[PDB]
Amino acid sequence: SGFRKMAFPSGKVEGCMVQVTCGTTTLNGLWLDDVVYCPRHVICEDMLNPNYEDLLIRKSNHNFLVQAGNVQLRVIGHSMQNCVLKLKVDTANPKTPKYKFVRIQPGQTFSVLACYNGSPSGVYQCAMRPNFTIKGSFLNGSCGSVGFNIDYDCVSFCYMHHMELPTGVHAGTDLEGNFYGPFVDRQTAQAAGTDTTITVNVLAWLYAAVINGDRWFLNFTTTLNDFNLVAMKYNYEPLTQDHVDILGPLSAQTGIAVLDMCASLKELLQNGMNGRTILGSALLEDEFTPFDVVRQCS
Amino acid sequence: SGFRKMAFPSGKVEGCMVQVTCGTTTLNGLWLDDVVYCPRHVICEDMLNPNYEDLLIRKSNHNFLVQAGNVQLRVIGHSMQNCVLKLKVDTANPKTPKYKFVRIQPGQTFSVLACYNGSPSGVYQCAMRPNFTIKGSFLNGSCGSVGFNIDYDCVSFCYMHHMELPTGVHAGTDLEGNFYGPFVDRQTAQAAGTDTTITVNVLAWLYAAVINGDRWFLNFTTTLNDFNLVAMKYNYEPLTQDHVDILGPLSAQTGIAVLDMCASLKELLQNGMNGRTILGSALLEDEFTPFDVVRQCS
Numbered sequence A, B: 001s002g003f004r005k006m007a008f009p010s011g012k013v014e015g016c017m018v019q020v021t022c023g024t025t026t027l028n029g030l031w032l033d034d035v036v037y038c039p040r041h042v043i044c045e046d047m048l049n050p051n052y053e054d055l056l057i058r059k060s061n062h063n064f065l066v067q068a069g070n071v072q073l074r075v076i077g078h079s080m081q082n083c084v085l086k087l088k089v090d091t092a093n094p095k096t097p098k099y100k101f102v103r104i105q106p107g108q109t110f111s112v113l114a115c116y117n118g119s120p121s122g123v124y125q126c127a128m129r130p131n132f133t134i135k136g137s138f139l140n141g142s143c144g145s146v147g148f149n150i151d152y153d154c155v156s157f158c159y160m161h162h163m164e165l166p167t168g169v170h171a172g173t174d175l176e177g178n179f180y181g182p183f184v185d186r187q188t189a190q191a192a193g194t195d196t197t198i199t200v201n202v203l204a205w206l207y208a209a210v211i212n213g214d215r216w217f218l219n220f221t222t223t224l225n226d227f228n229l230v231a232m233k234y235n236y237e238p239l240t241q242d243h244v245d246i247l248g249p250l251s252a253q254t255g256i257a258v259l260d261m262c263a264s265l266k267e268l269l270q271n272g273m274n275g276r277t278i279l280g281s282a283l284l285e286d287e288f289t290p291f292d293v294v295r296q297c298s
């Protein structure tokens, strides 16, 4: 019983964080096999309008200092892929877990291991927003921290932190260096664009609430089309038959039809929560996927 | 920028979780040096009214099966301390971190590594409630999961999970086996007693909100005594000069006097939040200590 924002155990990722220093810039890197991955702005004052190609040409292998705890790595190769720097080192990380690199979809969640100077300081869960930002918790020095999921023994790396926008939300790349969203690694104004609420995740959280005994919001039914009208009015993502199918296991376990749950959600959107709480929250929570609910309620 | 419920990196504790089996009961244990710690109800059907002394007498060392991943440990000793069982094994955990056993005070926070069958499944932060329960996230099989803090390289173990009460909140012990609160390890009705809100933690979170740009709730001043009148009316812990002194660093960094912040809090208690949010929450959050705020805002 109980429902919490739960991160994955971070041990397997803790073993791969290192510090990367270039000139006087220092940030975090990810050491997997014999490759270290970090944001290419480690090579930047220059960040206002950088020519990354030109700046990397002034660099040689020995200009990159890589420290794994108290262990110094020997950099024997370096290349740029999209917005990540890849540093070939002479040693394979003995702590390399089984892993993959994944580009997650908006709405999916992942655990963030926040790191400074190559040392982990905290773990927390968050979601890729529909507008490809994340609402993280990061201070200067946190660049190169990574987000991940764990399936059995395999770590799926999906996020490397690059930037805090002036609005205070965060932007980064997948581990091949492609930004999520329209962002570029330059210190210049950048619009994120309208965000929306992750509808399928809010429904999954209503199912979690029912599983936990919070039932007051159950009431009617609706149509996929009728609901999507109300979704649009309150800046919720449109619900698709694909989303309905993903909620099937929770619908089967609770006995509540998905469109019945949509009808509950519609009444909460149209009438507010009335000072009451659901799973300890006075707002509709959208950062639990259907998988997160099943994991934590299974 | 940003503020999140952040757990400690769990790696150092992941290395100490094992599975403990007795008869057909299986739960989690904590392997530190050559000792494994687990809830004594592993030796219990019997849980309605157990004579733990009598039940442990029927047991011998070889009745306790201890599995560390795929490694079997040899149990060479066993004893009961308060409500924990201590199993002497033949091998010292090579992964034992530097550690201590601590009994935390109500209001303090810790990270919980939720585990099943000796395998970690998730990490999250929570607080010891004033009434010595915790509002965790635990399913059957989670007993023996532990809560901890980390200071530099030292793990301070403060909590081992034993019980879910019928109200759905959770009860457990320190690592010497003394329950927090009035609870006993028996499946019989048990009152937790009135809880209250952790006042000093709510203030610390208001300072975090100011540090992050959420300033709308700043307004007046008050007296320690006047505020405590309002604290009592809304079931908040009384504020002491000790609490004021602990908030000093945040008061100094923000330039906001503690009693000025108390006056803001008083107006939020007396008028509600008016549909607005603070750090993304529509309720006053009390599970961040002043230390948690400084760590995450430093």
Ligand SMILES: Cc1scnc1COc1cc(Cl)cc(-c2cc(-c3c[nH]c(=O)[nH]c3=O)cn(-c3cccnc3)c2=O)c1
Pocket (backbone or CB within 6 Å): A024, A025, A026, A027, A041, A047, A138, A139, A140, A141, A142, A143, A162, A163, A164, A165, A166, A184, A185, A186, A187, A188, A189, A190, B001
């Ligand atoms: C988009 C707009 S518009 C006006 N301004 C911006 C922000 O523009 C950028 C662009 C780039 Cl390319 C990088 C950065 C950035 C760099 C570092 C950094 C630099 N050096 C270093 O040694 N270590 C580091 O960590 C840290 N953080 C940072 C701070 C707080 C939270 N999260 C990240 C950053 O945002 C910002």
Ligand SMILES: Cc1scnc1COc1cc(Cl)cc(-c2cc(-c3c[nH]c(=O)[nH]c3=O)cn(-c3cccnc3)c2=O)c1
Pocket (backbone or CB within 6 Å): A001, B024, B025, B026, B027, B041, B047, B138, B139, B140, B141, B142, B143, B162, B163, B164, B165, B166, B184, B185, B186, B187, B188, B189, B190
């Ligand atoms: C106080 C009152 S009044 C009416 N009822 C209660 C609850 O009474 C107790 C007493 C004791 Cl001594 C123990 C328990 C308990 C045991 C186990 C358990 C048992 N076996 C095993 O092999 N593995 C396990 O995990 C698990 N969970 C549990 C479940 C969900 C979340 N968290 C914990 C438990 O609560 C309950």
